[PDB]
Design a protein around this motif. Structure first.
Motif, PDB file in Angstrom:
ATOM      1  N   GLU A 161     -32.191  11.438  18.854  1.00  0.00           N
ATOM      2  CA  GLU A 161     -31.695  12.464  17.996  1.00  0.00           C
ATOM      3  C   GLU A 161     -30.201  12.238  17.705  1.00  0.00           C
ATOM      4  O   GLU A 161     -29.740  12.549  16.625  1.00  0.00           O
ATOM      5  CB  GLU A 161     -31.921  13.837  18.634  1.00  0.00           C
ATOM      6  CG  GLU A 161     -32.085  14.995  17.590  1.00  0.00           C
ATOM      7  CD  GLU A 161     -33.515  15.080  16.977  1.00  0.00           C
ATOM      8  OE1 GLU A 161     -34.533  14.908  17.713  1.00  0.00           O
ATOM      9  OE2 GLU A 161     -33.615  15.339  15.740  1.00  0.00           O
ATOM     10  N   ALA A 162     -29.450  11.713  18.670  1.00  0.00           N
ATOM     11  CA  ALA A 162     -28.027  11.466  18.514  1.00  0.00           C
ATOM     12  C   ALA A 162     -27.675  10.382  17.474  1.00  0.00           C
ATOM     13  O   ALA A 162     -26.930  10.640  16.527  1.00  0.00           O
ATOM     14  CB  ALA A 162     -27.430  11.120  19.865  1.00  0.00           C
ATOM     15  N   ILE A 215     -24.272   9.550  15.779  1.00  0.00           N
ATOM     16  CA  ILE A 215     -23.603   9.329  17.051  1.00  0.00           C
ATOM     17  C   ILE A 215     -23.944   7.935  17.592  1.00  0.00           C
ATOM     18  O   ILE A 215     -25.110   7.534  17.611  1.00  0.00           O
ATOM     19  CB  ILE A 215     -24.017  10.358  18.088  1.00  0.00           C
ATOM     20  CG1 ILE A 215     -23.480  11.759  17.743  1.00  0.00           C
ATOM     21  CG2 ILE A 215     -23.477   9.970  19.445  1.00  0.00           C
ATOM     22  CD1 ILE A 215     -24.239  12.944  18.467  1.00  0.00           C
ATOM     23  N   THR A 216     -22.929   7.211  18.053  1.00  0.00           N
ATOM     24  CA  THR A 216     -23.144   5.854  18.557  1.00  0.00           C
ATOM     25  C   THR A 216     -22.630   5.676  20.003  1.00  0.00           C
ATOM     26  O   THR A 216     -22.871   4.648  20.607  1.00  0.00           O
ATOM     27  CB  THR A 216     -22.492   4.791  17.658  1.00  0.00           C
ATOM     28  OG1 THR A 216     -21.138   5.140  17.438  1.00  0.00           O
ATOM     29  CG2 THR A 216     -23.138   4.690  16.348  1.00  0.00           C
ATOM     30  N   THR A 217     -21.885   6.627  20.529  1.00  0.00           N
ATOM     31  CA  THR A 217     -21.442   6.543  21.904  1.00  0.00           C
ATOM     32  C   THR A 217     -21.774   7.881  22.563  1.00  0.00           C
ATOM     33  O   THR A 217     -21.492   8.926  21.962  1.00  0.00           O
ATOM     34  CB  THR A 217     -19.927   6.325  22.030  1.00  0.00           C
ATOM     35  OG1 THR A 217     -19.574   5.057  21.497  1.00  0.00           O
ATOM     36  CG2 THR A 217     -19.485   6.325  23.493  1.00  0.00           C
ATOM     37  N   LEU A 218     -22.345   7.846  23.781  1.00  0.00           N
ATOM     38  CA  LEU A 218     -22.591   9.081  24.570  1.00  0.00           C
ATOM     39  C   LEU A 218     -21.895   8.988  25.893  1.00  0.00           C
ATOM     40  O   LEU A 218     -21.957   7.950  26.512  1.00  0.00           O
ATOM     41  CB  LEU A 218     -24.079   9.296  24.840  1.00  0.00           C
ATOM     42  CG  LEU A 218     -24.992   9.191  23.629  1.00  0.00           C
ATOM     43  CD1 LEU A 218     -26.432   8.940  24.099  1.00  0.00           C
ATOM     44  CD2 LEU A 218     -24.873  10.425  22.797  1.00  0.00           C
ATOM     45  N   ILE A 226     -27.365  18.107  20.520  1.00  0.00           N
ATOM     46  CA  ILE A 226     -26.999  16.726  20.299  1.00  0.00           C
ATOM     47  C   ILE A 226     -26.844  16.321  18.808  1.00  0.00           C
ATOM     48  O   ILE A 226     -25.859  15.712  18.448  1.00  0.00           O
ATOM     49  CB  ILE A 226     -27.943  15.746  21.070  1.00  0.00           C
ATOM     50  CG1 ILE A 226     -27.262  14.405  21.184  1.00  0.00           C
ATOM     51  CG2 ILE A 226     -29.321  15.530  20.387  1.00  0.00           C
ATOM     52  CD1 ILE A 226     -26.256  14.349  22.247  1.00  0.00           C
ATOM     53  N   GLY A 227     -27.811  16.701  17.966  1.00  0.00           N
ATOM     54  CA  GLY A 227     -27.782  16.321  16.584  1.00  0.00           C
ATOM     55  C   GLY A 227     -26.806  17.100  15.733  1.00  0.00           C
ATOM     56  O   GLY A 227     -26.856  17.012  14.539  1.00  0.00           O
ATOM     57  N   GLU A 228     -25.939  17.905  16.328  1.00  0.00           N
ATOM     58  CA  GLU A 228     -25.141  18.848  15.529  1.00  0.00           C
ATOM     59  C   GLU A 228     -23.651  18.811  15.851  1.00  0.00           C
ATOM     60  O   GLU A 228     -22.917  19.689  15.457  1.00  0.00           O
ATOM     61  CB  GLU A 228     -25.693  20.270  15.677  1.00  0.00           C
ATOM     62  CG  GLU A 228     -27.107  20.430  15.116  1.00  0.00           C
ATOM     63  CD  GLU A 228     -27.588  21.874  15.060  1.00  0.00           C
ATOM     64  OE1 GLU A 228     -26.799  22.803  15.397  1.00  0.00           O
ATOM     65  OE2 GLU A 228     -28.760  22.068  14.654  1.00  0.00           O
TER      66      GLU A 228
END
Ligand code: NI
Ligand code: NI
Ligand code: NI
Ligand code: NI
Ligand code: NI
Lengths: 833, 140, 140, 833
Positions: D415-416, D421-424, D637-639
């Motif tokens: 979802e990221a 998003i590419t880094t967590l 996560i997606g927001e």
């Protein structure tokens, strides 16, 4: 909801039933896939209701859809519908046999619970008047000829049922059967391979026995008669019969003889010929309809010796010491045998067992046990350690090879293997502008990455670089990096200088050059590009030109001796929507304007009925050697195979026969997506045909579904992808059945089963080691000396002219014109969308 | 003495009575590949500058007498990717006649100087008993 | 054994090129020398051949893994090669080691110093017995 | 059913159409995604019916949904709808262009076959009065200034069409065009980059030609003029023109001059400015609406030289020897170029080409071919071996970095990346109580496992240990194991002693400490926790406090110089459902009782309108430096990205401008989820902004969709995830289009493209080697000397007071109050649920 996987899948199955329900209520006649979804869906709902038992639904399921509500092929395609659901007493399997068991079905009940209005009968179309049908030669076959024989009285003196299979060593029977054990010695039942005689307790039967063949060595059973059949071991067997109390009463009078090839001999057993085909698949002389096309394939040669067919199952032939050998050297047991296959290949349409060893095709012929059967060579032994894939009644062909691939998305790959493709060749780096336009992986880095990316996938892969260069410098680099071929594309510039520089590079590295020519005739017309080839081998992509190249006459190339020409699949064949679709597709891919004079000129110059019609014919003529996809860049990955057969079907119906069957056309066409792509790209020793020594990349087909949807894809000797039903179910066949990856596609297996193809230069550097690949890596070769004459069954070289205004194509003096077909096979009968 | 023997000269094999006569020389007299201070193999002279980098030889053996079943000759030997890439007259096509595209001494090319020396294939011993690892060092 | 734990230089073994210069010339040889020395308990750096009047192959040897380039007269250390090599060093942040033109063939020391153009350069055996502009390399 | 993958996907697409159909029949105005599903669904059904041709449905599709049935943005968002289906003649592509082609549509027909009652028009709402619109400055641009020029007569003496692109070397044209070859030397067409002049046969045209730039070296075409442009090579080109029969007639009289920057000079070509923006994206001075927010980004600087834009395609600029260089050193070709990008980054909003080499951003500027174009530096060469990602008309930003992640489930990850998003960075071990409450991977073993688990995934990862300890013993261990940061959470106890012990550990290991404070004020109020920091850098999570910390005044921390403060996303921004949602979410996460006096006291002390309103403002003030998710533990996560822009949009509308555009606010905010998370966690040299030398972790956006749903995610220079339609289709755009993993996410690629971040101590031990990781591993650093002033564009340090009863927040004397927004952008227009 705590949904288990099976719940998630059934929701999908239900959704498909409901869609089918909506089409039904519209008075549409349902196809196979629709009939299935609909019935499984209702069965599940009836189980939810809790009112009905399994036995009930078995009946209720036959009375939902009737002949009226289905398409002409459905009653033959739908043998049955299976599904499992949760009854009040837990999960139970319901099989509905022959669901089209009547004329009208019961609409109300087919829709019941959908809350869709029930249509009246007159809303449905009127019935019209069998895909994959076997046309049997009339007659009988005598089993097991030229063998010593005897008829014996047998009694079951036990208190329980005893049943004996066709290939069980008769002396080794349950000690409670009483007969003449000495006369039974070396014998087995003279009955169709893989069936049985049942003796209820107390029963008397009169049995036809025939001698075992080959070496005549008995193994297993009770170990009564262990050893070769001879006078000395007979004496020992009789000693053991006596000592161990095996039922024995001498029948001094027993009729003895042989299985003679003449009428009314009482030792012989015959099998009705229609019935032979149904049990073991067709034999020499029988013909098989390819899918729902008009093509018939006639069995040219059979290796079977009638009566010793390899069939596996309870009481059947492939059992210890019978059809399964016991005592040969362990290293020569086949890893897998495919039994009773109809092979369709460019090299012959035959009936044969196929043995697989070490991921390779080890042998093709009559397989089994040399101790018990005549005609088994030492390279076709079914042994203890041999797996069995049952081909009886199915067609096997090589895995398809698509050699115009755009790696736009990984899902193209799943769609490919699922349709029957096992090797992909093209270029790309994912959904970029460059890859969407051209089969090019441009940077060495990206070669590295695409090889590593696809390393676990159970297909063979090749990647091609960007060949558009007027200096060799960067070409050397991309080949050294691992490109196994170069793409010349107009979008990167296909100019005479680039064409030359790129072919000179091909001459050095022994790689194929694939070309999409200068549509704009910017720097020359087709003759200038042909001149720039300078008699050097080159593969021309979508040679007809709708998908790219000199307007309007790139098709001229199908007449150059050094050109290897392919078509892409969407123009195949010329049908009623072809032109409209392609014009707009061109408008979309070129960002053109319906309302601007020259945009519409470019597009009418590119998409031309006259040349697409010519493509149907040159394709039938063997003037165009390969069919490929152009996956997501004007063509369709899952339709390489179907579009090939749809082109064949149309031409059979339009043109003259090519040489009482369709063998010559069948072989010409199968060659277009198997052997010829492998030759053109330089890896034909490894794949592209069903022949000994090549990878066992093999696709199993139902004749009723041939050319649309296969059963099973074998990759390197192991099942990689296949139709699979409910994972929770008691068998694999209950709904929803769909194409899913199998053990060959998990973990490290994909790599162990497949080949990444690179240039020799890249291999000389061990890029397999550098890149950390687990997939086998091999070099391409033998590509710089090919001419059109090296394309199997597709070596025609017409003089072609194209009128620059009319676009009319002339081949060898003959104006090429072809009709616009309104329908195609391998479509409406098969697909849910 | 400078470049080793050329066509017509003869070479005694070791201290045996055997004489190899050079059957063919690829050299064009005056352009021999010799590496050293002031010598031929230098940037822009015998060492090429500007050819595509992928085709530089990895190594060149300069001025070798080759003795091999197929012929006793005088040649430069080009090595690339661990393989023998070419046999012939090597150097820089920008400044010397007779240099084919598979014989380029480039920036990235190592030099093994064979002038005065004989090159043969590695011997192949096909009756070996692996009794000890030292046989192996004694063999190479 | 004498107390050295890091080695920096070039070469590929006992060849004419390596016996004269600290150059590992081919990308292939870089791979090999790094693999070769992989078990040896010392830190290692390998340097490519910097002698070039074009950057093309210099790019390649550094991408292969060279951590520095050597300019040696035996491969030609001319002002053009010196400039081209140092321009590369500015791009890749590697050190250029030089053994100047002893023969003053192309220039005297002044001319090589001019070719530096104020850029960092490591001069080997700066006194010159080991090589360089006669008799005054020491000026560096 | 033997369902192929494409059949399974279309069932899904159909389901989405039917849902859209149900919403329509309710008289809901459909959004973009709904309009699409509905139309593709019907197209597929009409194909099933078998009655309609492709040309028909092309028309029928424009007349289903009308302006009345859709939301205000839809007619601009829906350029068209594509789908493929099985016609009676096989699979065909149908493109419906501009489907909202009328006012009323045709409801009956939009629902036809769904069996849903057809609503009347008056059931639909009344029309209200353009997301991502380009506001063009008025005017024209003169192409190709300051260059030698000539106008020449050109004839097509061939019998077929010839078309020439803008950058083709004119002397190298098809030998059948006749003109003054000597005057054409060194010239090319003076026309907009990437279009063409078409010559039908026999046509005469008068062409404006302009000089090539840069080095003026000609390569390719026919090799007529190979070499630099000079008097000596002109003589050679003319020799070759004569010898080879290239059409040549001297035009002694031809008008010659230059492209001068003044009015009515006949050599110059101008391009209308609106049209420039449409072809190549906006240029300096143009403004771009971010999605459907009220934000406008103005192009601050453009590197383009008008007339030499890098555009790829047939006849276009990026072709051999034209825009694509030929003869530069192979090692410096860009691996990939992103062309004509609008970059939005904290460091500037600009227009530029972006070059990628070795997974890194190599350069940002004007790219192309130095042989033919002015202004191309040696680090921006498009060469043979360069892939092309077309940025024209799109926005590129850095991959987002979410630094408050709970690894509760692997699907958070998909979802990221799919949202941009590419880094967590965070902690966890899967769905345990500990991980569900806190960002902690507690055991060394679990560090090992999470690193190994996520090793193939195409994101950068960091994992944080449990920092709650009053002794350093076990902290040393978890960092040595590979934790790149420590979480102090109240659920494990955040006490002054733990806070101290943990920061002393951070000082030794150079890792960041993230904190969720003692909400209960059990051992101190906020001042006591601040004292315990002892002036040491610390990252405060969800600084506003709804998601945790000292009741009611943890927000005070946004004014401590050593505190780096972030917000989590669900309180962003204050909207009408915010408070109600959060109260209940708190009740649920704390297992509280609506009916118990003190449970409801705790919750009213935690979730406070006054502080959330203050959070909107401090966020706009640059007093809160980062926005993060809190994935599945109070946030989403997606927001991360959308909630950032929704906060910006609300503040633009509520507060004063911040410095005729929204640049300063745009840059302040983009910094909150890109550069500032990377600084705080210590890996800002590797990621977090579009700058040379950093990973090419890059997200492509449509301006109409910016901040809601991106097109494409580039990870380390290769496409990792992207919108993708039907894998079987002839192009990538037909339905269902959804975010799917790409080649960067298969096999070994994810690892080759990404970084696992650990502490230096863990790296000193080579945990990458120990753990068998294929992903690159790097150490975090430069984290113990950060203050609020190191947060790019978010360094504000207000004096904050909070009233302990009213909860009112005062910053720098000013009472902070903000309205409760009833709606937000980036929501209803975009999402199907
Ligand atoms: Ni093409
Ligand atoms: Ni293509
Ligand atoms: Ni020296
Ligand atoms: Ni928290
Ligand atoms: Ni949290």
């Amino acid at each position: 909801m705590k949904l288990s996987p099976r719940e998630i899948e059934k929701l999908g199955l239900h959704n498909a039933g409901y869609l089918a329900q909506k089409r039904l209520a519209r008075g549409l006649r349902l196809n196979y896939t629709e009939a299935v979804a609909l019935i499984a869906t209702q069965i599940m709902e009836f189980v939810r209701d809790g009112d009905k038992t399994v036995a009930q639904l078995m009946s209720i399921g036959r009375e939902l859809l009737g002949r009226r509500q289905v398409l002409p092929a459905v009653p033959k395609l739908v043998e049955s519908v299976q599904v499992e659901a949760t009854f009040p007493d837990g999960t139970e399997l319901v099989t509905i046999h022959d669901p089209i068991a009547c004329e009208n079905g019961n609409l109300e009940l087919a829709l019941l619970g959908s809350f869709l209005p029930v249509p009246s009968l007159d809303k449905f179309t009127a019935n019209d008047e069998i895909p994959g049908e076997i046309i049997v030669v009339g007659g009988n076959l005598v089993l097991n000829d030229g063998r010593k024989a005897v008829i014996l009285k047998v009694v079951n003196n036990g208190d329980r049922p005893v049943q004996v299979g066709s290939h069980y060593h008769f002396i080794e029977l349950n000690p409670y059967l009483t007969f003449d054990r000495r006369k039974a010695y070396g014998m087995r039942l003279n009955i169709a391979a893989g069936n049985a005689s049942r003796f209820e307790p107390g029963e008397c039967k009169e049995v036809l026995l025939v001698s075992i063949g080959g070496n005549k060595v008995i193994r297993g059973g009770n170990a009564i008669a262990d050893g070769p059949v001879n006078a000395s071991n007979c004496i020992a067997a009789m000693q053991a019969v006596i000592t161990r109390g095996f039922g024995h009463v001498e029948e001094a009078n027993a009729a003895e003889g042989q299985t003679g090839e003449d009428a009314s001999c009482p030792f012989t057993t015959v099998i009705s010929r229609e019935e032979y085909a149904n049990k073991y698949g067709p034999t020499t002389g029988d013909k098989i309809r390819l899918g729902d096309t008009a093509l018939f394939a006639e069995i040219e040669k059979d290796f079977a010796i009638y009566g010793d067919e390899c069939t596996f199952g309870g009481g059947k032939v492939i059992r210890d010491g019978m059809g399964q050998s016991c005592g040969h050297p362990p290293a020569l047991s086949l890893d897998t045998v495919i039994t009773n296959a109809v092979i369709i290949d460019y090299s012959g349409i035959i009936k044969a067992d196929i043995g697989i060893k070490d991921g390779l095709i080890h042998s093709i012929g009559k397989s089994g046990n040399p101790d018990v059967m005549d005609g088994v060579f030492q390279n076709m032994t079914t042994g203890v350690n041999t797996e069995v894939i049952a081909g009886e009644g199915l067609i096997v062909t090589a895995g398809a090879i698509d050699c115009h691939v755009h790696y736009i998305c990984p899902q193209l790959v799943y769609e490919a293997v699922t349709s029957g493709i096992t090797t992909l060749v093209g270029g790309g780096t994912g959904p970029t502008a460059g890859t969407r336009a051209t089969t090019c992986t441009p940077a060495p880095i990206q070669m590295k990455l695409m090889l590593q990316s696809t390393d676990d996938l159970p297909l063979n892969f090749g990647f091609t670089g960007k060949g558009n260069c007027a200096k060799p410098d960067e070409l050397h680099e991309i080949i050294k990096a691992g490109a196994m071929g170069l793409k010349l594309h107009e979008d990167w510039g296909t100019t005479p200088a680039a064409i030359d520089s790129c072919l000179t590079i091909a001459e050095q590295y022994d790689i194929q050059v694939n070309i999409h020519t200068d549509t704009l005739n910017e720097s020359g017309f087709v003759e200038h590009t042909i001149a720039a080839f300078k008699g050097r081998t080159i593969h021309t992509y979508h040679s007809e030109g709708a998908g790219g190249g000199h307007a309007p006459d790139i098709i001229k190339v199908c007449g150059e001796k050094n050109v290897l020409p392919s078509s892409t699949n969407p123009t195949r064949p010329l049908t009623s929507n072809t032109i409209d679709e392609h014009v707009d597709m061109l408008m979309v891919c070129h960002h053109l304007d319906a309302n601007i004079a020259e945009d519409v000129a470019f597009s009418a110059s590119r998409i031309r009925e006259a040349t697409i019609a010519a493509e149907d014919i040159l394709h039938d003529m063997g003037a165009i050697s390969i069919i490929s996809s152009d996956s997501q860049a004007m063509g369709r990955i899952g339709e390489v195979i179907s579009r090939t057969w749809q082109t064949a079907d149309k031409m059979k119906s339009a043109r003259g026969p090519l040489q009482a069957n369709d063998n010559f056309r069948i072989k010409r066409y199968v060659a277009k997506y198997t052997i010829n792509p492998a030759i053109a790209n330089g890896f034909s020793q490894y794949v592209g045909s069903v022949e000994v020594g090549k990878l066992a990349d093999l696709v199993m087909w139902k004749p009723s579904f041939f050319g649309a949807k296969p059963e099973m894809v074998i990759k390197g000797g192991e099942v990689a992808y296949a139709n699979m039903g409910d994972p929770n179910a008691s068998i694999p066949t209950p709904e929803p059945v769909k194409m899913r990856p199998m053990y060959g596609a998990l973990g490290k297996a994909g790599g162990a089963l497949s080949i990444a193809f690179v240039s020799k230069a890249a291999l000389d550097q061990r890029v397999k080691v550098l890149y950390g690949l687990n997939k086998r890596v091999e070099a391409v070769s033998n590509v710089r000396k090919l001419t059109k004459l090296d394309m199997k069954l597709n070596d025609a070289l017409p003089a072609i002219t194209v009128d620059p205004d009319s676009y009319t194509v002339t081949a060898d003096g003959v104006v090429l014109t072809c009709f616009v077909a309104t329908t195609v096979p391998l479509s409406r009968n098969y697909f849910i969308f | 003495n400078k470049y080793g023997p050329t066509t017509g000269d003869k070479i005694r094999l070791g201290d045996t009575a055997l004489f190899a006569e050079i059957e063919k020389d690829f050299a064009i007299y005056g352009d021999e590949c010799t590496f050293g201070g002031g010598k031929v193999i230098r940037d822009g002279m015998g060492q090429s500058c500007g050819h595509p980098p992928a085709l530089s030889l990895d190594t060149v053996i300069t001025n070798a007498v080759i003795i091999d079943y197929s012929g006793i000759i005088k040649a430069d030997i080009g090595i690339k990717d661990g393989l023998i890439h070419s046999i012939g007259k090597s150097g820089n096509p920008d400044v010397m006649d007779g240099v084919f595209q598979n014989m380029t001494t480039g920036v990235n090319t190592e030099v093994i100087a064979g002038e005065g020396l004989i090159v043969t294939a590695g011997a192949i011993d096909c009756h070996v008993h692996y009794i000890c690892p030292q046989l192996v060092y004694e063999a190479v | 054994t004498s107390g050295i734990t890091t080695l920096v230089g070039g070469g590929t073994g006992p060849t004419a090129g390596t016996r004269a210069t600290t150059c590992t010339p081919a990308p292939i040889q870089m791979k090999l020398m790094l693999q070769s020395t992989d078990d040896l308990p010392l830190n290692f750096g390998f340097t490519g051949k910097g002698n070039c009047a074009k950057p093309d192959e210099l790019h390649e040897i550094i991408k292969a893994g060279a951590m520095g380039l050597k300019l040696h007269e035996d491969w030609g250390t001319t002002p053009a090669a010196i400039d081209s090599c140092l321009t590369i060093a500015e791009q890749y942040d590697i050190q250029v080691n030089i053994h100047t033109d002893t023969l003053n063939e192309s220039g005297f020391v002044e001319h090589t110093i001019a070719a530096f153009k104020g850029r960092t350069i490591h001069t080997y055996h700066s006194e010159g017995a080991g090589g360089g502009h006669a008799p005054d390399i020491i000026k560096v």
